[PDB]
Design a protein around this motif. Structure first.
Motif, PDB file in Angstrom:
ATOM      1  N   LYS A  27       0.749  -1.206  -0.001  1.00 13.32           N
ATOM      2  CA  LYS A  27      -0.185  -0.012   0.056  1.00 13.32           C
ATOM      3  C   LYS A  27       0.832   1.330  -0.137  1.00 13.32           C
ATOM      4  CE  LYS A  27      -3.577  -2.250   2.612  1.00 13.32           C
ATOM      5  NZ  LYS A  27      -4.123  -2.534   4.184  1.00 13.32           N
ATOM      6  N   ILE A  28       2.181   0.952   0.231  1.00 14.04           N
ATOM      7  CA  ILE A  28       3.146   2.237   0.062  1.00 14.04           C
ATOM      8  C   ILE A  28       2.975   2.664  -1.333  1.00 14.04           C
ATOM      9  CG2 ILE A  28       5.358   3.141   0.418  1.00 14.04           C
ATOM     10  CD1 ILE A  28       5.914   0.596   2.475  1.00 14.04           C
ATOM     11  N   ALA A  29       2.786   4.073  -1.291  1.00 12.31           N
ATOM     12  CA  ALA A  29       2.757   4.776  -2.523  1.00 12.31           C
ATOM     13  C   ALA A  29       3.998   5.072  -3.154  1.00 12.31           C
ATOM     14  CB  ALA A  29       1.664   6.264  -2.473  1.00 12.31           C
ATOM     15  N   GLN A  30       4.727   5.689  -2.349  1.00  7.52           N
ATOM     16  CA  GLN A  30       6.234   6.054  -2.946  1.00  7.52           C
ATOM     17  C   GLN A  30       7.153   6.279  -1.916  1.00  7.52           C
ATOM     18  OE1 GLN A  30       5.437  10.510  -3.636  1.00  7.52           O
ATOM     19  NE2 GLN A  30       3.516   9.996  -2.845  1.00  7.52           N
ATOM     20  N   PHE A  31       8.323   6.104  -2.360  1.00  5.02           N
ATOM     21  CA  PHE A  31       9.486   6.062  -1.538  1.00  5.02           C
ATOM     22  C   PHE A  31      10.436   7.332  -1.575  1.00  5.02           C
ATOM     23  CE2 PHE A  31       9.759   1.753   0.460  1.00  5.02           C
ATOM     24  CZ  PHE A  31       8.696   1.235   0.186  1.00  5.02           C
ATOM     25  N   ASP A  32      10.454   8.088  -2.393  1.00 11.09           N
ATOM     26  CA  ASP A  32      10.946   9.399  -2.842  1.00 11.09           C
ATOM     27  C   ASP A  32      10.127  10.472  -2.861  1.00 11.09           C
ATOM     28  OD1 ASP A  32      13.636   8.080  -3.124  1.00 11.09           O
ATOM     29  OD2 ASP A  32      12.734   7.344  -4.921  1.00 11.09           O
ATOM     30  N   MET A  33      10.159  11.236  -1.979  1.00 15.95           N
ATOM     31  CA  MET A  33       9.183  12.491  -1.818  1.00 15.95           C
ATOM     32  C   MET A  33       9.766  13.800  -2.262  1.00 15.95           C
ATOM     33  SD  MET A  33       6.937  10.487   1.164  1.00 15.95           S
ATOM     34  CE  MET A  33       8.376   9.583   1.596  1.00 15.95           C
ATOM     35  N   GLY A  34       9.040  14.847  -2.322  1.00 20.07           N
ATOM     36  CA  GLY A  34       9.734  16.147  -2.372  1.00 20.07           C
ATOM     37  C   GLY A  34      10.199  16.383  -3.894  1.00 20.07           C
ATOM     38  N   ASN A  35      11.288  17.118  -3.759  1.00 20.24           N
ATOM     39  CA  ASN A  35      12.009  17.446  -5.137  1.00 20.24           C
ATOM     40  C   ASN A  35      13.041  16.434  -5.276  1.00 20.24           C
ATOM     41  OD1 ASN A  35      11.421  20.362  -5.724  1.00 20.24           O
ATOM     42  ND2 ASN A  35      11.929  20.716  -3.603  1.00 20.24           N
ATOM     43  N   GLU A  62       2.497   3.039   5.027  1.00 19.02           N
ATOM     44  CA  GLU A  62       1.889   4.017   4.346  1.00 19.02           C
ATOM     45  C   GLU A  62       1.087   5.079   5.184  1.00 19.02           C
ATOM     46  OE1 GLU A  62       1.726   4.587   1.121  1.00 19.02           O
ATOM     47  OE2 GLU A  62       0.242   6.106   1.375  1.00 19.02           O
ATOM     48  N   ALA A  63       0.744   4.730   6.232  1.00 18.33           N
ATOM     49  CA  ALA A  63       0.043   5.485   7.296  1.00 18.33           C
ATOM     50  C   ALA A  63       1.001   6.477   7.726  1.00 18.33           C
ATOM     51  CB  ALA A  63      -0.840   4.992   8.229  1.00 18.33           C
ATOM     52  N   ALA A  64       2.218   5.995   8.171  1.00 18.86           N
ATOM     53  CA  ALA A  64       3.159   6.749   8.870  1.00 18.86           C
ATOM     54  C   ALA A  64       3.761   7.545   7.800  1.00 18.86           C
ATOM     55  CB  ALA A  64       4.375   5.760   9.253  1.00 18.86           C
ATOM     56  N   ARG A  65       4.070   7.160   6.547  1.00 20.84           N
ATOM     57  CA  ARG A  65       4.539   7.893   5.632  1.00 20.84           C
ATOM     58  C   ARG A  65       3.483   9.226   5.254  1.00 20.84           C
ATOM     59  NH1 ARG A  65       3.457   7.196  -0.273  1.00 20.84           N
ATOM     60  NH2 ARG A  65       2.145   8.955   0.658  1.00 20.84           N
ATOM     61  N   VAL A  66       2.394   8.947   4.706  1.00 25.81           N
ATOM     62  CA  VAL A  66       1.519   9.767   4.446  1.00 25.81           C
ATOM     63  C   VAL A  66       1.180  10.976   5.497  1.00 25.81           C
ATOM     64  CG1 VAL A  66      -1.190  10.470   3.941  1.00 25.81           C
ATOM     65  CG2 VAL A  66       0.151   8.279   3.008  1.00 25.81           C
ATOM     66  N   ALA A  67       1.110  10.497   6.643  1.00 23.16           N
ATOM     67  CA  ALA A  67       0.732  11.684   7.985  1.00 23.16           C
ATOM     68  C   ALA A  67       2.029  12.347   7.857  1.00 23.16           C
ATOM     69  CB  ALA A  67       0.806  10.790   9.242  1.00 23.16           C
ATOM     70  N   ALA A  68       3.180  12.223   7.504  1.00 25.01           N
ATOM     71  CA  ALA A  68       4.151  12.916   7.511  1.00 25.01           C
ATOM     72  C   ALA A  68       4.313  13.799   6.343  1.00 25.01           C
ATOM     73  CB  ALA A  68       5.554  12.129   7.731  1.00 25.01           C
ATOM     74  N   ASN A  69       4.570  13.204   5.042  1.00 22.15           N
ATOM     75  CA  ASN A  69       4.569  13.938   3.924  1.00 22.15           C
ATOM     76  C   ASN A  69       3.397  14.876   3.578  1.00 22.15           C
ATOM     77  OD1 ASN A  69       4.637  13.437   0.583  1.00 22.15           O
ATOM     78  ND2 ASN A  69       6.297  14.453   1.542  1.00 22.15           N
ATOM     79  N   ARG A  70       2.130  14.367   3.907  1.00 21.59           N
ATOM     80  CA  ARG A  70       1.006  14.841   3.672  1.00 21.59           C
ATOM     81  C   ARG A  70       0.941  16.133   4.699  1.00 21.59           C
ATOM     82  NH1 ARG A  70      -3.148  12.859   7.208  1.00 21.59           N
ATOM     83  NH2 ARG A  70      -3.769  10.821   6.002  1.00 21.59           N
ATOM     84  N   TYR A  71       1.728  16.256   5.680  1.00 20.16           N
ATOM     85  CA  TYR A  71       1.775  17.429   6.684  1.00 20.16           C
ATOM     86  C   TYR A  71       3.166  18.262   6.097  1.00 20.16           C
ATOM     87  CZ  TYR A  71       3.229  20.356  10.322  1.00 20.16           C
ATOM     88  OH  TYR A  71       3.688  21.241  11.296  1.00 20.16           O
ATOM     89  N   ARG A 137       4.411  12.982  13.950  1.00 18.38           N
ATOM     90  CA  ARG A 137       3.124  12.312  13.575  1.00 18.38           C
ATOM     91  C   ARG A 137       3.282  11.039  12.911  1.00 18.38           C
ATOM     92  NH1 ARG A 137      -1.263  16.907  11.107  1.00 18.38           N
ATOM     93  NH2 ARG A 137      -0.977  18.313  12.739  1.00 18.38           N
ATOM     94  N   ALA A 138       4.505  10.865  12.477  1.00 18.59           N
ATOM     95  CA  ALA A 138       4.941   9.636  11.740  1.00 18.59           C
ATOM     96  C   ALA A 138       5.156   8.443  12.745  1.00 18.59           C
ATOM     97  CB  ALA A 138       6.143   9.664  10.789  1.00 18.59           C
TER      98      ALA A 138
END
Ligand SMILES: *C(=O)[C@H](Cc1ccccc1)NC(=O)CCCCCN
Ligand SMILES: [Cl-]
Ligand SMILES: [Cl-]
Ligand SMILES: [Cl-]
Ligand SMILES: [Cl-]
Ligand SMILES: [Cl-]
Ligand SMILES: [Cl-]
Ligand SMILES: [Cl-]
Ligand SMILES: [K+]
Ligand SMILES: [Mg+2]
Ligand SMILES: [Mg+2]
Ligand SMILES: [Mg+2]
Ligand SMILES: [Mg+2]
Ligand SMILES: [Mg+2]
Ligand SMILES: [Mg+2]
Ligand SMILES: [Mg+2]
Ligand SMILES: [Mg+2]
Ligand SMILES: [Mg+2]
Ligand SMILES: [Mg+2]
Ligand SMILES: [Mg+2]
Ligand SMILES: [Mg+2]
Ligand SMILES: [Mg+2]
Ligand SMILES: [Mg+2]
Ligand SMILES: [Mg+2]
Ligand SMILES: [Mg+2]
Ligand SMILES: [Mg+2]
Ligand SMILES: [Mg+2]
Ligand SMILES: [Mg+2]
Ligand SMILES: [Mg+2]
Ligand SMILES: [Mg+2]
Ligand SMILES: [Mg+2]
Ligand SMILES: [Mg+2]
Ligand SMILES: [Mg+2]
Ligand SMILES: [Mg+2]
Ligand SMILES: [Mg+2]
Ligand code: NA
Ligand code: NA
Ligand code: NA
Ligand code: NA
Ligand code: NA
Ligand code: NA
Ligand code: NA
Ligand code: NA
Ligand code: NA
Ligand code: NA
Ligand code: NA
Ligand code: NA
Ligand code: NA
Ligand code: NA
Ligand code: NA
Ligand code: NA
Ligand code: NA
Ligand code: NA
Ligand code: NA
Ligand code: NA
Ligand code: NA
Ligand code: NA
Lengths: 156, 132, 142, 337, 172
Positions: A27-35, A62-71, A137-138
């Motif tokens: 369910k993990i969407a991505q591993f590299d985020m941002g720029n 996925e929940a840990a990642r989203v909660a962090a990046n989404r923020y 949050r993560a």
RNA sequence: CGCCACACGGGGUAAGAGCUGAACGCAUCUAAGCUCGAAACCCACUUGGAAAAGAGACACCGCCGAGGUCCCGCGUACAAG
RNA sequence: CGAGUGGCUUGCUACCUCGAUGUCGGUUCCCUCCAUCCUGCCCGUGCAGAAGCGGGCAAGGGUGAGGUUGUUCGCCUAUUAAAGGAGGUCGUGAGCUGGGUUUAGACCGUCGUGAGACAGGUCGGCUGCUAUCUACUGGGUGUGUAGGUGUCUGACAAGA
RNA sequence: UGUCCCAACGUUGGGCCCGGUGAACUGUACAUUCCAGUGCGGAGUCUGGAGACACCCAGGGGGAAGCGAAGACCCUAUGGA
RNA sequence: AGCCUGUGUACCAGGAGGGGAACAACCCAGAGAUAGGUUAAGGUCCCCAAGUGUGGAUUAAGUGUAAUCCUCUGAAGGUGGUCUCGAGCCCUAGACAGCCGGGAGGUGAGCUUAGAAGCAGCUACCCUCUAAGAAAAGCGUAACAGCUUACCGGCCGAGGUU
């Protein structure tokens, strides 16, 4: 289902896809985020360090990642920072869902084995640690207690 | 509610069949509940003179039949005690259909009524022919 | 009434448990002891919790029964009994040769046993047995 | 689901055993307010009749109107405070200190007591005043007894003795008030303590019924429907659960019922007279004829006809006193018929 | 630690055991100052608060004892006063001093008078729609002022709409 | 199925509302102190209770006699007792 | 998504009992828990009032009557301040009941060549014992305190 | 129409006391228990506490996983019919 | 799972005696009889043999007084409760906080807009006086006013802050 059922690393490593079929997708969407176009050319580098060896289901990842990046959108959709989740859920996990007869369970998911002291997440930011908050949050959505660690950053 | 100014031995229960003392078109009434009353295990909810009871129409005009209405107990066979110690009892058990405001649904009350019922339902009383 | 005590101990401002422990040990050595001013004996701690314990003991019970004292009188005596094998001959003898009193019915002023006194000047969290009894509902007959 | 339901009977009047004294013993006395005065009196139950009264209640929509009220007639002849007992405060509660007796005794008080032939009134009195000087003096009460011989309807001559507290202004003032009463002959009457219209607490040993079953003794149901024909009619379902494996004292069981002491609160004294005005035609059933000092108590009083009952000024009244109610009619109609 | 409070010329402060009394032209206030290992003593011209410990809990009380004493100094000389204002929207609220307790009648139309008993030697002088609570014992005065305000407390309805009551207008 | 009687009020608290108040010059209902505040707790009230082994107190009578049991006539009592 | 608490449901296990610990439901009678339905005292409100909604303390008391069903559960009606849930060998058959489940008779449907089978339906279908100990409710006889009469005290105990 | 609300009073035979007659069930032992714990996980007897003076009469049956029956259910036996 | 099924070892079974409240396998310990002595595990306030032992510190919750464990729970998360150790920066040229005073003008900037004046939106954000003072950080207004942050000065006097 509760993490209580799979958070421990007491079972043999079970990752050979050549002998295991029907493994649920991650369910993990991505591993590299941002720029991700840019390389770690930032002043500050904070990391989220797991403080106990545990198994983390791709669910929590996925929940840990989203909660962090989404923020991390306290910086903007195209903000200047890069976020990395370095672990991948290799451990296949079963469930015995007859009673204790022929109980070898069937594949129900995947988890990542993390050892105490490893960093699961790594962010790269300019003196603008909103990331320190993205992590409070993560580690909120993963089993272990965690250490938020800053490496390149003597700008305190 | 207001003191009846007389002691009552409820002579009725849930399920009792009593007379409808008015010209609403309802002849017989079946007691279903007693306003403001709560009993006790195994006890049949009871009702007597001066109580406002919920009722259903057992006998009468087709349109009135099966209807669930409110009413007031105007007469009961079981004795009641008045301040001077005398007991008072009637020839039958009867109630008068009433509405939300407690005004008789009918225009005329058939038969006598206990004086005590007046100290509670004025419009019902002020519609009485005989008030004993 | 009239008790030939070989020793008269003054509980005023003393730690009940530490007094009892010593009164127990002496009674088992054959001494006749009398504890005085029980109502003024003290026990360290947060009054709220302390009282909860004693109130629980009062409430506990059933047909067989759990008679627990409320007066500082018995409270103290029951404390001592808990330090003696009161169901054995020797124990019952020792216990029976010990009596606790409200105030002091003697002429002599009791003595203060070593290590049992509480310095009110360096202690704020503690309670009086009398205070406890009043909380329990006792009749302040002192 | 099993509907809820209050337990059967109260657990506040036990154990439900036979009373130790047929003569009641109050366990509470009024508060020391007004002037010094004996806080109680006694008499013998005779029976019941009704009386018509004028609504005395100022808040009643009927105030001023006729009203039938049930009354229990109690013969309340004079009693005699034969002594003044003094209590002292000690680390263990109150304890009798001494007593001040007299010399004038009722001809038959020796049917109960070993009447004093040699007593030192002053020494006693002295000991009491010293106690008071030291401030150890606890309340003051009078040893009192009745004169059954004064009541024909009552077979006994042997007097009933009971201690009654004396509540008054100061301790000194009521201490004196006590001694005065005693010294005389102790002879006092219902008038001296109660006034018609006041509320009193009446104590007494109820009518005995020997052993009785749960149904009557505790108010438990009777087996119902089919169950009432199987072999069980008046026995409860069970003595308890499997565990705890013991029968709890709280489960309703058979035993002595009746002949227990009871202090019935707030009884209004409708009237205090003397004569035969309250007697019934043919006589009070199983009692006799009334013609002497009497009291009319509102409603019922514990105990059977002839039993000694005790009065005490209400200790917890709900209403204010409404003195000397107008009595328009006292029925004397036969209680037979 | 140790702190020294020079007592005002106008005042005299005596102390035996754990009790300190302060007397001035405006009155006298006695307080109990009891805490583990904190000694309070009157050294002629100055009151001394000292202790052999310096842990946070100790320092806290020391500072508290100080303000308590100074407050007493102030109360025996200048005194303490709280100013209050009675206020109503529809029902004329009547605030009177009867005995040792201030009574308030007709609050929001209430038939039953609301009251509260005054603490210590606190004077509650009322003039029109203004009240003045005063005395040498700040503890007592402060509470009496408060109690008065609390006395018109309302929980049942919206306070923003039903604002009637007496309020502390000026704190010393 | 009829009729009579069955509080209030004190004390201490919880949640909560506040006072004074420092650590931390300010602020702060709390850390020390304090004012209030539940059908809950304690007291009040009713009932039992000298077998409470610290086995109680007082008055009088009596130790060659006080008092009691049996007996007889009966119940305000009662399955025997 | 993560961390837990309970031991009411359901499942797992096969430790205990097969020289038997009587089943479900109901009933009757007793005690208890609090994760509170009502009642008391409170906080917030998208709190004008009234009527609510949500939350805190709190287990003193209350939480009832009926229509279908063996039902537990549940659906439904009218009352109600409210008509809360749960533990006690799924409390309670040396207490009751015996409608269901779960013996032998019989029928139907389905399955079977058949005997016969089927948490499918259906009609009928039994309830033993004089209490030794212990437990408690009440009643006596003795001994201890150490002769008698009368009156009290109150450690404690019970209450809604 | 007492099946129920909601129980009452009464009749007869018992029951209770007395004379006479006179069994049975059951019994490893000990045994005045209660609350908790522990133990093969369902204790009057173990452990810790609490309570507890002895004997007797009546009662309704909470417990002795009460008495009665080598479980009739279920499985197992190279059992039977 | 006090589950099922392996393996190595020691134990119970078939192992006393000491300790662990009780308790097959946890600790000491392997034991002929009798006797004296010293230890082991474990314990020394009383019950209960031996310390109300010594130097020092922490804890205020009765936390705790519970090696192991079906048995002794307590978690993620949180804590200006308190104690201890470190680093950076500021400070008697007066710090941190508080209180008092000052917070000025060109000017109500321009733009848009009827309107907008620190503060609807857009752009810009310049220089004067001065010991300070934004083309205004937060409220507030229909827009003003009004109330305050920044910034300066005074009072005060010792550590403060991260
Ligand atoms: C099923 O539960 C069986 C049914 C059955 C068995 C045999 C004969 C008829 C019915 N019931 C039982 O096994 C009950 C057992 C009772 C044991 C009591 N100790
Ligand atoms: Cl109803
Ligand atoms: Cl008890
Ligand atoms: Cl012992
Ligand atoms: Cl302290
Ligand atoms: Cl029944
Ligand atoms: Cl060996
Ligand atoms: Cl403790
Ligand atoms: K079995
Ligand atoms: Mg029913
Ligand atoms: Mg039958
Ligand atoms: Mg008659
Ligand atoms: Mg007649
Ligand atoms: Mg409202
Ligand atoms: Mg059985
Ligand atoms: Mg709660
Ligand atoms: Mg309860
Ligand atoms: Mg069951
Ligand atoms: Mg049940
Ligand atoms: Mg049974
Ligand atoms: Mg049976
Ligand atoms: Mg039987
Ligand atoms: Mg059947
Ligand atoms: Mg059937
Ligand atoms: Mg079957
Ligand atoms: Mg059938
Ligand atoms: Mg003996
Ligand atoms: Mg034992
Ligand atoms: Mg068998
Ligand atoms: Mg078979
Ligand atoms: Mg065969
Ligand atoms: Mg073997
Ligand atoms: Mg020793
Ligand atoms: Mg603990
Ligand atoms: Mg552990
Ligand atoms: Na299978
Ligand atoms: Na976590
Ligand atoms: Na202690
Ligand atoms: Na107790
Ligand atoms: Na039968
Ligand atoms: Na029968
Ligand atoms: Na059973
Ligand atoms: Na209160
Ligand atoms: Na005695
Ligand atoms: Na759990
Ligand atoms: Na068996
Ligand atoms: Na059942
Ligand atoms: Na409750
Ligand atoms: Na139903
Ligand atoms: Na069972
Ligand atoms: Na059953
Ligand atoms: Na049966
Ligand atoms: Na009948
Ligand atoms: Na039994
Ligand atoms: Na071996
Ligand atoms: Na052992
Ligand atoms: Na503890």
């Amino acid at each position: 289902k509760p993490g209580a059922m799979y958070r421990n690393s007491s079972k043999p490593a079970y990752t050979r896809r050549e002998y295991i079929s029907g493994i649920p997708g991650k369910k993990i969407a991505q591993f590299d985020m941002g720029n991700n176009g840019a390389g770690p050319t930032y002043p500050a580098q904070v990391e989220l360090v797991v403080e106990k060896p545990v198994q983390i289901r791709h669910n929590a990842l996925e929940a840990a990642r989203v909660a962090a990046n989404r923020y991390v959108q306290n910086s903007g959709a195209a903000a200047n920072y890069k976020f990395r989740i370095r672990k991948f859920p290799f451990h296949v996990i079963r469930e015995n869902k007859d009673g204790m007869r022929a109980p070898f369970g069937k594949p129900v998911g995947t988890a990542a084995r993390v050892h105490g002291a490893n960093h699961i997440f790594i962010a790269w930011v300019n003196p603008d640690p909103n990331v320190e908050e993205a992590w409070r949050r993560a580690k909120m959505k993963v089993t272990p207690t965690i250490n938020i660690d800053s490496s390149p950053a003597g700008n305190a | 509610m207001e003191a009846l100014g007389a002691d009552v031995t409820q002579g009725l229960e849930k399920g009792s069949l009593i007379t409808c003392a008015d010209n609403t078109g309802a002849r017989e009434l079946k007691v279903i509940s007693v306003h403001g009353y709560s009993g006790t295990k195994n006890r049949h909810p009871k009702a007597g003179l001066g109580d406002k009871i919920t009722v259903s129409v057992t006998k009468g005009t087709p349109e009135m039949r099966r209807q669930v209405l409110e009413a007031v107990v105007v007469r009961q066979r079981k004795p009641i005690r008045r301040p001077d110690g005398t007991r008072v009892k009637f020839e039958d058990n009867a109630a008068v259909i009433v509405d939300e405001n407690e005004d008789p649904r009918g225009t005329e009350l058939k038969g006598p009524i206990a004086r005590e019922v007046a100290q509670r339902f004025g419009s019902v009383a002020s519609a009485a022919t005989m008030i004993v | 009434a009239e008790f030939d005590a070989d020793v008269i101990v003054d509980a005023r401002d003393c730690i009940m448990g530490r007094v009892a422990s010593q009164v127990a040990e002496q009674a088992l050595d054959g001494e006749t002891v009398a504890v005085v001013n029980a109502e003024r004996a003290v026990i360290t701690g947060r009054e709220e919790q302390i009282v909860e314990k004693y109130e629980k003991r009062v409430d506990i019970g059933n047909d067989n029964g759990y008679f627990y004292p409320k007066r500082p009188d018995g409270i103290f005596k029951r404390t001592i009994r808990g330090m003696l094998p009161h169901k054995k001959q020797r124990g019952r003898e020792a216990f029976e040769s010990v009596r606790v009193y409200l105030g002091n019915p003697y002429d002599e002023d009791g003595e203060v046993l070593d290590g049992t006194s509480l310095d009110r000047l360096s202690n704020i969290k503690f309670v009086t047995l009398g205070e406890i009894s009043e909380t329990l509902g006792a009749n302040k007959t002192w | 689901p099993q509907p809820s339901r209050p337990r059967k009977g109260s657990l506040g009047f036990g154990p439900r055993k036979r009373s130790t004294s047929e003569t009641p013993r109050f366990n509470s006395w009024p508060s020391d307010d007004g002037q010094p005065g004996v806080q109680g009196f006694a008499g013998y139950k005779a029976g019941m009749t009704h009386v018509v009264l004028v609504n005395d209640e100022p808040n009643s929509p009927r105030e001023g109107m006729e009203e039938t009220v049930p009354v229990t007639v109690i013969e309340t002849p004079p009693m005699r405070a034969v002594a003044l007992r003094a209590y002292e405060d000690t680390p263990y509660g109150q304890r009798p200190l001494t007593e001040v007796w007299t010399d004038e005794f009722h001809s038959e008080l020796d049917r109960t007591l070993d009447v004093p032939e040699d007593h030192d009134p002053d020494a006693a009195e002295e000991q009491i005043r010293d106690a008071h000087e030291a401030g150890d003096l606890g309340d003051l009460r009078l040893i009192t007894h009745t004169v059954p011989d004064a009541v024909p309807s009552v077979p006994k001559k042997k007097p009933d003795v009971m201690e009654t507290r004396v509540g008054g202004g100061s301790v000194s003032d009521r201490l004196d008030h006590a001694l005065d009463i005693v010294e005389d002959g102790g002879e006092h009457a219902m008038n001296d303590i109660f006034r018609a219209g006041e509320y009193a607490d009446v104590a007494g040993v109820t009518k005995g019924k020997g052993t009785q079953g749960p149904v009557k003794r505790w108010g438990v149901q009777k087996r119902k429907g089919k169950h009432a024909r199987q072999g069980w009619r008046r026995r409860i379902g069970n003595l308890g659960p499997w565990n705890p494996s013991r029968v709890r004292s709280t489960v309703p069981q058979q035993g002595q019922t009746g002949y227990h002491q009871r202090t019935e609160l707030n009884k209004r004294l409708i009237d205090i007279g003397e004569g035969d005005e309250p007697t019934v035609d043919g006589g009070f059933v199983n009692y006799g004829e009334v013609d002497g000092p009497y009291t009319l108590v509102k409603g019922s009083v514990p105990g059977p006809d002839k039993r000694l009952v005790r009065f005490r000024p209400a200790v917890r009244p709900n209403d204010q006193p409404r003195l000397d109610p107008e009595v328009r009619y006292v029925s004397n109609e036969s209680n037979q018929g | 630690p140790r702190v020294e409070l020079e007592i005002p010329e106008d005042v005299d402060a005596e102390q035996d055991h754990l009790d300190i009394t302060v007397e001035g032209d405006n009155g006298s206030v006695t307080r109990r100052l009891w805490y583990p290992d904190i000694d309070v003593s009157v050294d002629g011209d100055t009151v001394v608060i000292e202790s052999d410990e310096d842990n946070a809990k100790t320092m806290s009380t020391i500072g508290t004892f100080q303000s308590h004493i100074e407050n007493m100094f102030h109360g025996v000389t200048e005194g303490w006063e709280y100013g209050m204002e009675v206020f109503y929207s529809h029902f004329p609220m009547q605030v009177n001093v009867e005995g040792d307790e201030v009574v308030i009648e007709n609050f929001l139309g209430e038939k039953a008078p609301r009251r509260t008993t005054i603490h210590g030697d606190t004077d509650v002088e009322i003039d029109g729609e203004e009240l003045t609570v005063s005395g040498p014992d700040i503890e007592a005065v402060g509470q009496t002022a408060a109690d008065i305000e609390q006395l018109t407390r309302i929980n049942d309805k919206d306070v923003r709409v039903f604002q009637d009551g007496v309020y502390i207008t000026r704190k010393p």
